Design a protein around this ligand. Structure first.
Ligand SMILES: Nc1nc(N)c2nc(-c3cccc(O)c3)c(-c3cccc(O)c3)nc2n1
Ligand SMILES: [Cl-]
Length: 263
């Protein structure tokens, strides 16, 4: 896994441009390869042996999940300590949802492509859990196709919204596939609304308390352009955010339904 990865000297890169932030992300130009890449440097000034090894586990987990809808990783840079990744021109879904009103055919495809990627992770032996899925992680290429990113919290802030209610109920609960299914439901909410969940609210703790009983983000209305598929996606979202995690569908089932929304 970590053998096909490379080590990058900072001399190999050029024209650094900040893009995200967590740790800052930079669009760099590999000079000898004549192509662009992304690199994520650590926030700290000193990088201890936990960081260096943690970054390596993130890279290994990315290479293991080589797939169409997963972000490719090339190696780890040493000069500044950071992860050398594929550059996605269109950037994050978060930025795209803020940017402008999106057509529904796209929205449904972004949802489906994300779902296919997540399904792939869960299909591994053993399953790879993402445990961090949010529109900031969901990255889009020049032609608006998804690649899932940020395996920093994977397993073999304003982010309370993506946290499952069972995680608030029980201190130190065992992580599962149904964690990702919940977060994915909140992503769907983001696509249907182009809003951030609980954006306007007074306080975190009140909403996090109400979530443990049943209070989820307010349902969007049925859209005019694609009212049949919208209603269907909304349905799926609701099943994906159920309080009882055994009621939530598997990504095998989810992909099966999101595919029909693209037909
Ligand atoms: N254009 C572009 N290209 C990228 N390759 C890119 N990569 C990331 C990223 C960050 C950490 C880990 C990781 O596996 C990917 C982010 C990123 C993800 C989450 C939060 C954040 O601040 C930045 N944004 C990006 N944007
Ligand atoms: Cl429709």
């Amino acid at each position: 896994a970590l053998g096909l990865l490379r080590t990058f000297d900072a001399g190999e890169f050029a024209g650094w441009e900040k893009v995200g932030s967590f740790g800052q992300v930079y669009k760099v130009r590999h000079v000898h390869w004549k192509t662009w890449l992304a690199i994520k440097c650590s926030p700290s000034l000193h990088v201890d042996d936990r960081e260096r090894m943690e970054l390596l586990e993130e890279a290994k987990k990315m290479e293991m999940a080589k797939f169409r809808y997963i972000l490719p990783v090339y190696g780890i840079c040493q000069e500044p300590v950071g992860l050398v990744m594929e550059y996605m021109e269109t950037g994050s879904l978060e930025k795209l949802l803020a940017s402008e009103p999106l057509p529904w055919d796209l929205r449904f495809r972004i949802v489906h492509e994300t779902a296919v990627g997540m399904n792939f992770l869960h299909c591994m032996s053993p399953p790879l859990l993402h445990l961090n899925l949010k529109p900031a992680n969901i990255l889009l290429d020049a032609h608006y196709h998804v690649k899932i990113s940020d395996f920093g919290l994977a397993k073999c802030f304003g982010t309370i919204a993506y946290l499952p209610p069972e995680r608030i109920r029980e201190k130190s609960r065992l992580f599962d596939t149904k964690h990702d299914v919940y977060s994915f439901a909140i992503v769907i909410w983001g696509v249907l609304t182009q809003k951030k969940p609980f954006a306007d609210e007074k306080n975190i703790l009140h909403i996090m308390m109400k979530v443990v009983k049943g209070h989820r983000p307010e349902l969007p209305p049925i859209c005019r352009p694609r009212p049949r598929a919208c209603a269907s996606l909304i349905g799926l979202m609701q099943r994906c955010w159920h309080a009882d995690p055994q009621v939530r569908p598997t990504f095998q089932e989810i992909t099966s339904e999101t595919e029909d929304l693209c037909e």
